Design a protein around this ligand. Structure first.
Ligand SMILES: O=[N+]([O-])c1cc(-c2ncccn2)ccc1NCCCCCCN1C[C@H](O)[C@@H](O)[C@H](O)[C@H]1CO
Length: 765
C-alpha cells in the first residue's frame, strides 16, 4: 500500500513551475523532457530590447518586487511581477488539471498591465519558449492558414515515452497588435503572431536568451542584405519581429507584439486524459485553487495574538507562498574533487595552506547526472539546494503538506555517496553552473553542514506517534506507510551519523585533556584563518589560529541532535542493538559538553583549541555559538547552566536587541568587524530555535518556567514585527536584520528561512 501512496504522489507532483531561477517557466520532475519559459521587453529603439528583455531572476533599481501571492505545488498558484524598467505589472496564474496516466494537464494566464508612468502606446515584445530533450521524442508546430504568421492560436503536437502524446496551445490573446505601413510588410506581413521551430544539440536548449538573439540577429542581417537601410527604416518592433517558419524541431519560439495592455493563455492537454483543456477550464480551476488555499491557510497557520489581524494574515500568505513557490526540480552534473588528498585531513598546524595547494591541483571533475527536488534560499542570487537551509525551509512546508516535505527529504538523501556525504551546495546542470564562478562550484567530500533535516523528521515522528487534501497527510494518516518510509531512510541517516564521527572528529587522547568519554569531541573540516563555511556561520569568530586541537561546541551539539533522532526512529523500528549504542553516545556527549566546552568564568559554552604551551584553552565569544546546547534542546529544564544562558539571552548589553537576538555580543572584540556577516546581525533561523526552546521551558513545571515565558513572549513579538515592518516598507524578506536600526540588509527575496516567521506566529510548538 506504501507503493500505491508513492505512485499517486509521483503523479500529483510531476508538473509544476519548478524553474524558480526564471520569472516564470514549467518543467516536470524528469531530467530530459519538455520545458517552457516567459520572456518580455518593451521596445522603443533599434538597440534597447537586449537591455530590457526579462528572463532570469534579478533585483536592481529597475525591478520593484515580484513573488507568489498564493501557491501549492499540487494545485498551482498566482505570481505578481512589478517591473519599473518595462513599466508593466504582470500576473502569471498557473493551475494543474488531474487526469490520464502521464501526470495530468496544466494551464497558465499571462496578464500584462501598463503602469501609470508607461506611454499608453508602448510596444511590449512577449515570447513563450518551448524545448524538448530525448532521442525518441518529437514536437511540431501545426502551420497557419494565413501567409506571414497567425491570426489565431498556435498548436504544438508532441510525443515522448515520458509524457505520451500532448497538444500545448498558445492562444491568440486580447490586446492591440500593432500594424506596419512599411514596404517590409509586403514580405513579412503588417504584424502578427509568429513561430520559429529550430533544432540544437540537447545540452544547449536551456540557453533561451542567446538562442533567441541569434534568430533576431539573423532577421536583422537579412534586412541589410535586402536593402532595408536608415534611408527609410521599418519600425523597431517590426525589425525584431521574427520571420514565421514553423515546423518540427527541439526548440519552438512563439513571439507576439502588443500595444498597451494584454493577456494570453498556455493550455497543455495530456492526450491520455479526458477532452482537451480550454480557457474556460483555466478560469474555473484558478477560482477553485484560491478557495482551497484560503481554507488550508486558516487550518494550518492559525495566527495567534497579537497577529490575528488581516494585515498579519496577508503578510503570512506572502512569506509562505514564496517559500513553497521557490521549489525547483534540478538535473545534471556536479563538480566534485574526488582526490581525497591527504592535506584535507587537516592534521597539521597551518593545515589551510596545505589544503589550498591540493585545491590548486584542480583534480575535480563532472559526475552524475544527479536529480534534486528542493526549496531554495534566493530566486535572484542563489536558486539551488543548500543542505542545512532546507531543514529550516521544510519546517513550515511540512505543516502545509507532510507528504510533500518527505518527497523533498527523500530527494536530498538519494544524493548520499557510499561514504555517507551529501554535498552542502547542489549546483546541478550547466543552467545552475552559469550563475556560479568556476572557483565556487567545486564541492568537497570532507566538508559537512548542520544536519537540520533531522529536526523535520523529529516533527514527523511526533505526528506519527499522536484527493490533494487526502495525499497531503497520507504518511501520518496511514501509519503502516510512515514506518515503511522510515524503514528505508533509517539506514541512510545511520550512515550519515557514522560519516560525521569518522570525518569531523576532534583530538582528545593526544593532548593534556581529561573528560568522561575519550570518543566524543568534534571539529569542522574546512575552516580558514577568518572563516568556517561548513558550520553555516561563515565569519563567527573562532580560535586564533585555527588548529587541529580545535573543538567546536556547535558541531558536538548537532551530533546531540542526530543521536536523539536515531534513538527516536531506531526505537520505532525496534533496532535494540542500535539504540543501545546511541544511548551510551548521548550520555557521553552530555558529560563531555560540560567537561570540554563549559566556562564557569564566562558563564556559557565555548569553542576550544590548545595553547602556545600545548595546554587545552577555552576561547569564549558570547553569541549564537555560546547558546548552542540550549538551541538544540540538550539541557535538562532544571539545569543551572540553562539558567545562566537565559541571563545572557535576556542581557541588553550582550545579545538582546529590540529587533531579536544579536549573532555576536556588543562586548565581544569582533562585534561589527570585517564583513560583519555573523558578527552582530540578527538571523531568523537561530532566533526561531531560541523561540521554540524557550516555549518548551515555559510550558513545564520547573525553576525557569516564568523567566522563559517572559522572553518567549517578547522575542516572538520583536522578530515577527522586525520582519513585518520591513515587508510593509519594502515588499521583501531580508537575509538578516540590523540590531541598531532594525532594517533588513544583505540579500532581498530570502524565502529562504526568514519565512519561519509564519510558524512563529501560529505558535502551539
Ligand atoms: O553571486 N551572486 O549572485 C550574489 C549577489 C549578491 C548581490 N548582488 C547585487 C546586489 C545585492 N547582492 C549577493 C550574494 C551573491 N552570491 C553569494 C552565494 C552564497 C550565498 C550563501 C547564503 N548563505 C550564507 C549563510 O551563512 C549560510 O548559513 C547559508 O547556508 C547560505 C545559503 O543560505
Amino acid at each position: 500500500l506504501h507503493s500505491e501512496i508513492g505512485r499517486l504522489n509521483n503523479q500529483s507532483l510531476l508538473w509544476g513551475p519548478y524553474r524558480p531561477n526564471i520569472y516564470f517557466g514549467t518543467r516536470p520532475r524528469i531530467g530530459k523532457s519538455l520545458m517552457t519559459g516567459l520572456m518580455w521587453g518593451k521596445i522603443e529603439s533599434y538597440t534597447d530590447f537586449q537591455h530590457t528583455v526579462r528572463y532570469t531572476c534579478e533585483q536592481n533599481e529597475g525591478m520593484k518586487g515580484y513573488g507568489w501571492d498564493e501557491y501549492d505545488p499540487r494545485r498551482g498558484g498566482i505570481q505578481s511581477i512589478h517591473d519599473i524598467q518595462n513599466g508593466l505589472d504582470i500576473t502569471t496564474s498557473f493551475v494543474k488539471i488531474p487526469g490520464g496516466a502521464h501526470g495530468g494537464s496544466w494551464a497558465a494566464r499571462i496578464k500584462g498591465t501598463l503602469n501609470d508612468d508607461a506611454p499608453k502606446d508602448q510596444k511590449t515584445i512577449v515570447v513563450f519558449y518551448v524545448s524538448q530533450e530525448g532521442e525518441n521524442s518529437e514536437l511540431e508546430a501545426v502551420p497557419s492558414e494565413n501567409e506571414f504568421g497567425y491570426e489565431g492560436d498556435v498548436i504544438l503536437k508532441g510525443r515522448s515515452e515520458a509524457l505520451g502524446n500532448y497538444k500545448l496551445v498558445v492562444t491568440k490573446g486580447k490586446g492591440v497588435i500593432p500594424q506596419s505601413d512599411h514596404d517590409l510588410s509586403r514580405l513579412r506581413g503588417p504584424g502578427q503572431t509568429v513561430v520559429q521551430s529550430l533544432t540544437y544539440p540537447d545540452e544547449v536548449l536551456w540557453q533561451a536568451k542567446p538562442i533567441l538573439f541569434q534568430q533576431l540577429k539573423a532577421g536583422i542581417d537579412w534586412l541589410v542584405e535586402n536593402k532595408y537601410d536608415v534611408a527609410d527604416p521599418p519600425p523597431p518592433w517590426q525589425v525584431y519581429l521574427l520571420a514565421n517558419k514553423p515546423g518540427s524541431g527541439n526548440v519552438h519560439i512563439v513571439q507576439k507584439v502588443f500595444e498597451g495592455d494584454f493577456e494570453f493563455d498556455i493550455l497543455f492537454s495530456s492526450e491520455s486524459a479526458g477532452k482537451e483543456v480550454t480557457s474556460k477550464d483555466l478560469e474555473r480551476e484558478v477560482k477553485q485553487a484560491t478557495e482551497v488555499f484560503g481554507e488550508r491557510f486558516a487550518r494550518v497557520f492559525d495566527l495567534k495574538a497579537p497577529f490575528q489581524g488581516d494585515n498579519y494574515k496577508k503578510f503570512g500568505k506572502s512569506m509562505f507562498s514564496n517559500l513553497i513557490g521557490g521549489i525547483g526540480y534540478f538535473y545534471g552534473h556536479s563538480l566534485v574533487d574526488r582526490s581525497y588528498a591527504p592535506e584535507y585531513d587537516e592534521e597539521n598546524e597551518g593545515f589551510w595552506e596545505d589544503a589550498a595547494e591540493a585545491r590548486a591541483r584542480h583534480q575535480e571533475a563532472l559526475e552524475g547526472p544527479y536529480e534534486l527536488f528542493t526549496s531554495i534560499p534566493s530566486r535572484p542570487f542563489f536558486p539551488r539546494g543548500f543542505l542545512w537551509d532546507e531543514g529550516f525551509h521544510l519546517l513550515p512546508i511540512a505543516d502545509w503538506d507532510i507528504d510533500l516535505a518527505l518527497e523533498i527529504i527523500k530527494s536530498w538523501y538519494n544524493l548520499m555517496d557510499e561514504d555517507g556525504w551529501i554535498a552542502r551546495e547542489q549546483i546541478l546542470g550547466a543552467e545552475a553552473r552559469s550563475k556560479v564562478p568556476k572557483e565556487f562550484q567545486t564541492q568537497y567530500p570532507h566538508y559537512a553542514n548542520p544536519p537540520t533535516l533531522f529536526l523535520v523528521l523529529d516533527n514527523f515522528v511526533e505526528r506519527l506517534r499522536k484527493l490533494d487534501e487526502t495525499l497531503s497527510t497520507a504518511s501520518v494518516d496511514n501509519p503502516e506507510v510512515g514506518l515503511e518510509y522510515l524503514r528505508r531512510l533509517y539506514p541512510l541517516l545511520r550512515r550519515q551519523f557514522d560519516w560525521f564521527r569518522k570525518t569531523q572528529a576532534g583530538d582528545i587522547k593526544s593532548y593534556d585533556r581529561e573528560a568522561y568519554s575519550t570518543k566524543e569531541a568534534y571539529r569542522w573540516r574546512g575552516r580558514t584563518v577568518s572563516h568556517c563555511l561548513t558550520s553555516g556561520l561563515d565569519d563567527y569568530p573562532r580560535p586564533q589560529p585555527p588548529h587541529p586541537g580545535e573543538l567546536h561546541v556547535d558541531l558536538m551539539s548537532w551530533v546531540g541532535v542526530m543521536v536523539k533522532s536515531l534513538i527516536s526512529i531506531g526505537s520505532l523500528l525496534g533496532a535494540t542493538e542500535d539504540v543501545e549504542f546511541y544511548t551510551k553516545v548521548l550520555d557521553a556527549i552530555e558529560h563531555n559538553l560540560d567537561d570540554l566546552h563549559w566556562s564557569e568564568k564566562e558563564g556559557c559554552y565555548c569553542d576550544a583549541t590548545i595553547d602556545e604551551f600545548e595546554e587545552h584553552k577555552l576561547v569564549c565569544h558570547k553569541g549564537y555559538i555560546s547558546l548552542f546546547p540550549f538551541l538544540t534542546g540538550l539541557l535538562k529544564p532544571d539545569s543551572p547552566k540553562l539558567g545562566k544562558l537565559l541571563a545572557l539571552i535576556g542581557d541588553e548589553s550582550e545579545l538582546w536587541s529590540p529587533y531579536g537576538l544579536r549573532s555576536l555580543s556588543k562586548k565581544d572584540e569582533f562585534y561589527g568587524t570585517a564583513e560583519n556577516y555573523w558578527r552582530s546581525p540578527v538571523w531568523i533561523n537561530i532566533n526561531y530555535l531560541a523561540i521554540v526552546q524557550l516555549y518548551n521551558i515555559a510550558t513545564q513545571d520547573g525553576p525557569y518556567k516564568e523567566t522563559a515565558r517572559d522572553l518567549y513572549t517578547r522575542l516572538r513579538k520583536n522578530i515577527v514585527e522586525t520582519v513585518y515592518r520591513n515587508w510593509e516598507e519594502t515588499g521583501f524578506a531580508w537575509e538578516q536584520y540590523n540590531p541598531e536600526t532594525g532594517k533588513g540588509q544583505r540579500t532581498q527575496h530570502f524565502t529562504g528561512w526568514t519565512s519561519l516567521v509564519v510558524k512563529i506566529m501560529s505558535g502551539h510548538h
